[PDB]
Structure formats: C-alpha cells, structure tokens
Design a protein around this ligand. Structure first.
Ligand SMILES: Nc1ccn([C@@H]2O[C@H](CO)[C@@H](O)[C@H]2O)c(=O)n1
Ligand code: NI
Ligand code: NI
Length: 332
C-alpha cells in the first residue's frame, strides 16, 4: 500500500518461519537409478541442506515394491510429511486417492496431470523437445545410419521422448533407421542388456536409453562391446534425465581411455522438487495447477558432451527453431 499508518513493530527475536516436511514416493526401485529417481532425490537432499534438515528428520524417500505398495507408501508418508511427491506417471491414481483422504496435505505428481484437486500440483516436461535434440545429435554422429531407442514402459510420457527422438533424427536424415524396443519396466537392467545387445548386433551404433534403471543394462552392454574393440569402432549411448557423461568411461582393446556417452537429455526433476518444496513451505503451494517445463525455461535440455562441432551447430540451430515456433516437435 501507498501508506501504512496503523502499524506495529515485530522484533526479530519473536519472528519465525514455519517449515514443511517433504517426501518422495518412488514408482519402482531406489534413489540410485542414475536418472529419474536419483535426480528427484538429489533435489530433495539439496532442499533439506538449505533448510538444516536430515534424512528422516524433515525429508525422506519411500521405495515402492509394486503398484500395490503405492497407496501404503503414500499413507505412511502422511504420518510425518505435509508435502508428498509421487515421482512417475504410474502414481497418478494412488496420488489422487491420497489427496482426497488428506485435504490438509499437499501432493505433487511428477510426469502426469491430476485435474480438479486443490491440494495436488502436476508437473510435466517437454521430453519431446529434449528427445528431438538427442535425435539431431544421433543423426549427425551415426556411421551405420542405424540408431536404437530402448523405452521403459509404453506410455504417453515415453512416447513424447520417442516421437521427439524420431522427428529429430528425420530432421537431419530420414534414411536413418530407428530401431524401437520397450523393456516393459523401469527396473529391469537384465532386459535393458538383452535389448541393447540385439539393437547393437542388428547394427545400431547409438542407443538412447529412456527406461530409468533398466538403462543400467544398456550401459553394461555398450561397455562390454567397447572394451573388446578399438576406440574408433566404439558404439555410443545417449544419457537420460541426468548428465550421465561420467557413466560412459572405459578402456578400449588397444589401451586408449575413452567415453561412450555421446550426449544426455536433461530433465530437472531435482530442481522442481526443491522449487515446489520452497513454495509449499512459504504457503504458496501451486494447488490445482499444471507446471510445464520445456526447452525455453531449461526444465529439459541437451548436454552436448562428446558431440562433433557440426553436431553442436545442428543442435543449437534445432533448439533456436523449437524456441521461436519454426519447428513444432510432435508429442506422439
Ligand atoms: N522409475 C522411473 C524411471 C523413469 N521413468 C520415466 O522414464 C524416463 C527416462 O528415465 C524418465 O524421465 C521418466 O519419465 C519413470 O516414469 N519411472
Ligand atoms: Ni505498501
Ligand atoms: Ni493495531
């Protein structure tokens, strides 16, 4: 206001900020998947450090054993936590039922939308846009003109990555074959390994793994192949969610230390967890809203890493065309 004549002083010794307690509930696996779950957890840990908290004293994670465990994990979380993140589209129905039971608590669904629930915020990422950039990169480096995509679970979410990836590859060279295989799980490394083994055997020189912890198998297969060959015949992996450059270190057959990560799509799940936790604690929880992260706000990106200069220029050009609306990336 212009003036505030009726005012009273509050001494700093009497003032306090009321904190919140935040928990993530996993859709499958732990907080060491080197991707989705880990990004969320490092976010929550960073938030905890900023607020002088520690694990099980202000923040924690509940690992889900199956779909049947979602409801039980959310109900357990409601004992001590007043901000609860369902990390993954699979938690949709369970988060919806939990928010209706506990109208005094705040819930966040990561990667999916719940409508008409005042205590639920939804967060989506334009993974089609980051996928497109990964496709431009893949198309500018493949020598076999054959690339692979290993999906976790067939879904709207993984279809965004897949549609974006195909469109990006075709934007550079439509001749390039994309082999698509799904593991049917985000926590099945053994299946990631067999799919990657077959994709590489069928002549892919690059595999984009978009399957969470299932992707550990794709890294395992590419490492084994690359260790038993010369450096100049290595096959590539594209990283997902986190910059996975450090996961691609190996020694070739001819004793050269190298790296088989070409590029990584980024999905700033951690940053969203920290930002929404800060908003919940300040009493500004965005209940009932859908928060869309895209290339524009750097909620998704491509880490260029080991890409050729001509690759980086095609990526910069594709990014500019996505931001200005010149290129519309398909979501399916
Ligand atoms: N446990 C997991 C792991 C991953 N995902 C989805 O798969 C994408 C690639 O890791 C992630 O970005 C995410 O969309 C998931 O839904 N649940
Ligand atoms: Ni004023
Ligand atoms: Ni007064």
């Amino acid at each position: 206001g212009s003036s505030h004549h009726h005012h009273h002083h509050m001494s700093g010794e009497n003032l306090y900020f009321q904190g919140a307690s935040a928990a993530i509930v996993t859709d499958t696996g732990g907080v060491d998947d080197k991707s989705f779950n880990q990004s969320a957890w490092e976010g929550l840990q960073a938030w905890g450090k900023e607020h002088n908290l520690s694990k099980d004293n202000g923040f924690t994670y509940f690992q889900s054993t199956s779909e049947a465990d979602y409801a039980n994990n959310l109900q357990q979380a409601a004992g001590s936590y007043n901000l609860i993140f369902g990390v993954g589209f699979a938690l949709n129905n369970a988060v919806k039922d939990a928010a209706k039971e506990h109208t005094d608590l705040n819930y966040v669904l990561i990667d999916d939308v719940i409508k008409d629930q005042k205590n639920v915020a939804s967060v989506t990422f334009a993974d089609n846009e980051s996928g497109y950039l990964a496709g431009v990169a893949a198309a500018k480096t493949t020598k076999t003109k054959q690339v692979g995509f290993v999906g976790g679970i067939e879904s709207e979410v993984i279809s965004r990555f897949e549609a974006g990836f195909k469109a990006g590859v075709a934007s550079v060279d439509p001749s390039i074959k994309v082999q698509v295989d799904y593991a049917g799980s985000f926590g099945d490394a053994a299946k990631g390994k067999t799919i990657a083994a077959a994709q590489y055997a069928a002549g892919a020189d690059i595999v984009y793994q978009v399957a969470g912890g299932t992707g550990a198998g794709v890294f395992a297969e590419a490492k084994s192949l690359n260790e038993s060959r010369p450096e100049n015949e290595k096959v590539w992996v594209i990283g997902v969610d986190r910059d996975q450059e450090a996961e691609g270190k190996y020694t070739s057959k001819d004793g050269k230390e190298s790296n088989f990560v070409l590029v990584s799509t980024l999905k700033q799940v951690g940053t969203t967890v920290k930002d929404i936790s800060n908003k919940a604690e300040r009493g500004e929880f965005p209940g009932g809203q859908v928060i869309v992260y895209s290339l524009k706000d750097k909620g998704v990106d491509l880490a260029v890493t080991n890409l050729s200069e001509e690759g980086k220029k095609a990526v910069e050009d594709a990014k500019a065309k996505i931001l200005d609306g010149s290129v519309k990336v398909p979501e399916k």
